[PDB]
Design brief:
part of a larger assembly; 8 chains; A alpha+beta (about 230); B mainly beta (about 200); C mainly alpha (about 25); D alpha+beta (about 90); E alpha+beta (about 110); F alpha+beta (about 100); G mainly beta (about 60); H alpha/beta (about 130); F: about 100 residues; alpha+beta; four-stranded mixed β-sheet; H: about 130 residues; alpha/beta; two-stranded antiparallel ribbon; RNA-binding; zinc (chain E); metal-binding (chain E)
RNA sequence: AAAAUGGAGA
RNA sequence: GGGGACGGGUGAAACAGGAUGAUCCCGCCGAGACCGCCGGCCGCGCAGGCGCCUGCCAAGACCGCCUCUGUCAAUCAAGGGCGAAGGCCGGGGGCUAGAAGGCGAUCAGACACCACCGUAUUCCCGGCCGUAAACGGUGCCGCCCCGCGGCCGGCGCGCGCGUCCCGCCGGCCGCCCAGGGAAACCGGGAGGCUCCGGGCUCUGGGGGGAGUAUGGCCGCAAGGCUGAAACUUGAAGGCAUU
């Protein structure tokens, strides 16, 4: 419940070590991610430096307490960009859907739709959002298989790219984490795509940062506790 | 005249005197008469620029890299040759460089080089053909042509010398620490012969 | 695969004849 | 026409001498050496080889630092786009 | 003496296909001659499911369910008994036997 | 598809003046609707046409590329570096905006 | 570490390819009711007390 | 207040390695393997191997202060195997009998998006 | 894991 | 960067890895191939063949039509155009497998099978080769059929409008009724045929010798393509029953 090395001697390689608390952005209400260990600075290594740039995996359920139905599938990778008060302050790095749910999505009788889209964040983090959706049988279709017609599939690939463009074309990472966590955007995609044709599991498989700008100091402050100014 | 490799004259605004200073650069392929090579610490990676190797990103094709900072040009100058920054490591301000031959060496980040392969590539593929092309080729270089083999010369001249039947007489591999006159055979061979190609 | 190890044997026999026919002439 | 049926026509200028490997290899390289490629700015196929490495196009009146035997050597042609990739990524 | 009308393949309106290698044999097999049984299995063994479920630190957790395809070669299938050679009457029976709708790699 | 189709559409119905000098003359009097210039444009034409176009408000956009290719697009073997469009025959949807 | 007393709730089947082994379904006579199939040699009957086990080794019912 | 770290456990046809590490995984709490406990090459990845390897090191992770662990079972994956190894689940069983507590379990098998040539020849392995 | 013959001719 | 002695490999073993710290665990990166599950009695295409995302260019087949053309048709020597892999010829490239070649370990030999390296190759471009169990072991264009169901392409049919039914279907097919077949089996034919005669190219004539010899042609070569005999000797073979 407290830094393990501070009180406990530990093993001979670990006899000299440290334990620093990691704090998530405000969007994850359970800010604590726990504690990550580093070497106590002996001058060979700055204690702060190893903490400044390391990415720690937190599943949505650990990141915020909530329903398991919407937590296990969404994994958030958080990479710190700054160390203050002897604590790691994490920043958005990426999200991934677990191999479990992606495996469940795959089924015979439908052809998957996979579209890779590029988002220019107003902040400067070029973000690549990958979207997967699937086909499901018509309620009263005479045939078991629901493979869509080619005309619809050409429309489907175009449809998913739009809406992703409207929702994410002009939004910063502070807006983006909330739109991925709320699943509001994933749903918005379903409404537009649903009218075109029946489609299932319209979810973003993963969103990863191709390039993030230097000096994300303002963003780090915005993400950590500036929710008061923005919604 | 001597170097098959193209030489490119580029003039820069002299910092002090009004007149422009003219400097000869080994030509990187893709350089065009009238190209403006922007060169400096903040110069981009467009082909032809001179910039600090550390700022150049990983995997780039570079020519005319400098062995130590400001050596005014050192490695990778030959026709068709290139060097690649394997990683701009910041651990000791030292960028990794893969030399044209393929060894892995390191240079201080403050070393500078030109992006783009040295021009004139494929020079040795064409057979020289007629020996005369060789007399003309070496007419711009050293008087090293034509070469006389060791077993041909009379014994007072070459260590390989000549026996009754033009036999080398002993093993070509001669030690690294041999007297200047002795080192006439293959120097310090680690493995003679043709093996599994040359790749292991 | 006897057919393969007969056919290619025949080809080795055919090649032997070519050297024998030309070198001798 | 087709005065010498064998494909070794540019290199028929040698005759029986110089082996069969060298003459064939030379045919491909020599034809590439005198070929008219298209200069980038002129966009017209008027380029020849002034001397090994430097090639110029009569119309464009510009000298391109190309390869010894072709305006665009195959490895450089790739490096071109690889510099473009790193650059576009940088900003 | 044609053995099967399908010829071990479902190739119709076709001439050539892609090759997937046996997990056991490593033998390349065209997609047509490969068994392709799809198997759903829980990542933990069923025996220790109880103690790991007992260690449910996160609320409402469920076992990791793995979706994978098994594609043994023809020779790999018979020796590992994925399928068994059958008689002329049994040759046309298009169903896997021993029911087993149970969800695990081992049929238990 | 549309940009190339427009090029063929202008050749049959619209008035197209091929060649750099002719373009300058058309732009100066204000008899200009669009200018499509290939990538292999000498930089001077690119800067001088930019100034000339800005004053006459004439919208200009780059061609996909190759002055030779712009030539193939207007049906002419001869290279066309910049093609002024006057009285476009059937719409100017290609012009950006 | 002590051989854990066990209750042979039932006998399963004779295996090992010579029939010599008779793996049986078991439950802990001492413990929080741990129950697992264990490998047994020699004669076994239900309600037997097997006080000869380390508990960790686990057998299986597929045969 | 609590603490947890990832186990990053690996299964093998030759030998399993259990390497409990922390958050990122850059910093390794403890390293153990089944060869270090047994003395036969065939039983180095055996079912008894994992059970013996854990618990022997579980005390060091408890002393290091990581009571809770996150098991990320990994089979050889990539070109071959795909499914879990023989001694994979055995390791979780012995540590779960120990006080270690598991929040979430994930599969980290390095599945390939269109793989490189499968090792061995076109006839596979004619053992 | 290895694991090779079986003279002719009723 | 962490950490701490084993790691590889198997059927067991060993060959080579590793306290200059391997395996392992994460980040960061560099090329080069590959496009996973979805992925099919699915579809496409003259076949060989066809699976990354974005676009772009020329099509193809299809169905529907009160759209002209008016026999422009079928099969086709000669003549062309393609054609998997492997091979070759020069470059480029080289991630993995890996003809050779090396090892270890097997067995009286292990030349091999199996482990571990590893060159050519594989990938791309520009040419040559022109062959495969290139097989549906079944040339093409027609006609007539016996019913029961799928899958894909349109296009109609009424129906409380649901990928609802029902046809027109063009293709993908499964089982199969007579009929046929030495049989096996085919029956969207291999049937309508000893009651043996729509059209048109190809091919065969016991098993060897022999795809050999000899010419010609082709290829850079490897090889291709064309193609006998002297002599042998009684079966070779086909599908089925125990």
């Amino acid at each position: 419940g407290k830094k393990k090395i501070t009180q406990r001697k530990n093993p001979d390689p670990y006899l000299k070590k440290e334990w620093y608390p990691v704090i998530a952005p405000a969007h994850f209400k359970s800010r604590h991610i726990g504690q990550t260990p580093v070497t106590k600075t002996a001058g060979l290594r700055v204690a702060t430096d190893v903490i400044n740039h390391r990415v720690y995996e937190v599943n949505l359920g650990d990141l915020n307490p909530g329903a398991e139905d919407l937590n296990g599938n969404t994994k958030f990778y958080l990479q710190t960009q700054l160390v203050s008060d002897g604590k790691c302050l994490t920043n958005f790095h990426g999200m991934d859907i677990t191999r479990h749910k992606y495996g469940s999505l795959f089924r015979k009788g439908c052809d998957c739709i996979d579209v890779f889209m590029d988002i220019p964040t107003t902040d400067g983090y070029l973000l690549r959002v990958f979207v997967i959706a699937f086909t499901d049988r018509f309620r009263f279709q005479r045939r078991k298989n629901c493979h869509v017609k080619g005309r619809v599939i050409r429309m489907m690939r175009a449809g998913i790219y739009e809406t992703l463009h409207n929702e994410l074309g002009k939004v910063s990472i502070p807006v983006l984490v909330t739109k991925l966590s709320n699943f509001e955007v994933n749903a918005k995609l379903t409404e537009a795509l649903q009218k075109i044709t029946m489609c299932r599991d319209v979810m973003i498989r993963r969103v990863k940062v191709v390039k993030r700008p230097r000096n994300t100091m303002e963003l780090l402050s915005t993400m950590h506790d500036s929710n008061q100014v923005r919604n | 005249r001597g170097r098959g490799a193209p030489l490119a004259r580029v003039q820069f605004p002299n910092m002090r005197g009004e007149g422009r200073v003219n400097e000869l650069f080994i030509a990187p392929e893709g350089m065009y008469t009238g190209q403006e090579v922007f060169s400096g610490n903040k110069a981009t990676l467009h082909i032809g620029n001179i910039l600090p190797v550390g700022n150049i990103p990983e995997g780039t094709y570079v020519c005319n890299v400098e062995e130590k900072p400001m050596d005014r040009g050192c490695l990778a100058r030959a026709s068709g040759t290139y060097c690649l920054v394997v990683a701009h490591n910041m651990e000791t301000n030292k960028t990794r460089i893969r030399l044209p031959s393929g060894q892995k060496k390191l240079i201080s980040s403050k070393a500078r080089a030109m992006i783009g392969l040295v021009a004139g590539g494929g020079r040795t593929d064409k057979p020289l053909l007629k020996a005369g092309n060789a007399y003309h080729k070496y007419k711009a270089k050293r008087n090293c042509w034509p070469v006389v083999r060791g077993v041909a010369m009379n014994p007072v001249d070459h260590p390989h010398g000549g026996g009754n039947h033009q036999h080398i007489g002993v093993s070509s591999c001669v030690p690294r620490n041999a007297v200047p006159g002795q080192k006439v055979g293959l120097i310090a061979a680690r493995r003679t012969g043709c093996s599994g190609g040359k790749r292991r | 695969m006897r057919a393969k190890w007969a056919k290619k044997r025949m080809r080795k026999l055919k090649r032997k004849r070519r050297h024998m026919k030309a070198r001798s002439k | 026409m087709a005065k010498r049926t064998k494909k070794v026509g540019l290199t028929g200028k040698y005759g029986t001498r110089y082996g069969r490997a060298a003459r064939k290899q030379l045919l491909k390289i020599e034809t590439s050496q005198k070929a008219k490629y298209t200069c980038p700015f002129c966009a017209k196929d008027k380029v020849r080889r002034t001397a090994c490495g430097i090639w110029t196009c009569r119309s464009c009146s510009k000298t391109m630092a190309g390869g010894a035997y072709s305006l665009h050597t195959e490895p450089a042609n790739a490096a071109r786009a690889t510099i473009r990739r790193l650059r576009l990524a940088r900003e | 003496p044609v053995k099967r009308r399908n010829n071990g393949r479902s190739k119709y309106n076709c001439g050539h296909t892609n090759i997937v290698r046996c997990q056991n044999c490593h033998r390349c097999v065209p997609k047509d001659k490969v068994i392709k049984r799809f198997t759903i299995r829980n990542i933990v063994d069923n025996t220790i499911a109880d103690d790991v479920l007992n260690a449910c630190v996160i609320q409402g957790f469920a076992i990791p369910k793995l979706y994978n395809k098994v594609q043994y070669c023809v020779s790999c299938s018979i020796h590992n008994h994925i399928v068994r050679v059958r008689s002329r009457e049994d040759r046309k029976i298009r169903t896997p036997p021993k029911r087993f709708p149970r969800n695990s790699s081992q049929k238990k | 598809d549309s940009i190339s189709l427009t090029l063929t559409l202008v050749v049959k119905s619209g008035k197209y003046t091929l060649g750099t000098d002719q373009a300058i003359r058309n732009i100066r009097d204000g008899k200009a609707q669009l200018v499509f210039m290939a990538n292999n444009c000498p930089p001077l034409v690119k800067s001088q046409v930019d100034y000339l176009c800005h004053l006459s408000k004439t919208p200009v956009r780059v061609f996909a590329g190759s002055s030779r290719e712009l030539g193939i697009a207007v049906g002419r073997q001869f290279n066309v570096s910049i093609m002024t469009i006057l009285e476009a025959g059937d719409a100017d949807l290609t012009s950006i905006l | 570490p002590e051989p854990i007393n066990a209750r042979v709730i039932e006998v399963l089947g004779r295996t090992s390819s010579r029939g010599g082994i008779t793996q049986v379904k078991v439950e802990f006579m001492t413990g929080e009711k741990r129950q697992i199939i264990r490998n047994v040699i020699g004669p076994v009957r239900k309600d037997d007390i097997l006080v000869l086990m380390e508990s960790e080794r686990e057998a299986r019912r597929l045969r | 207040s609590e603490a947890f770290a990832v186990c990053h456990i690996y299964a093998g046809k030759n030998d399993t390695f259990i390497h409990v590490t922390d958050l990122s995984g850059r910093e390794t709490i403890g390293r153990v393997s089944g060869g270090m406990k047994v003395k036969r090459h065939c039983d180095e990845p055996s079912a008894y191997a994992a059970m013996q390897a854990t618990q022997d090191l579980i005390e060091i992770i408890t002393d290091r202060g990581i009571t809770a662990v996150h098991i990320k079972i990994r089979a050889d994956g990539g070109t071959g195997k795909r499914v879990y190894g023989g001694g994979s689940a055995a390791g979780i069983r012995a540590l779960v009998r120990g006080g270690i507590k598991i929040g979430r379990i994930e599969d980290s098998t390095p599945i390939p998006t269109d793989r490189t040539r499968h090792k061995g020849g076109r006839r596979g392995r004619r053992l």
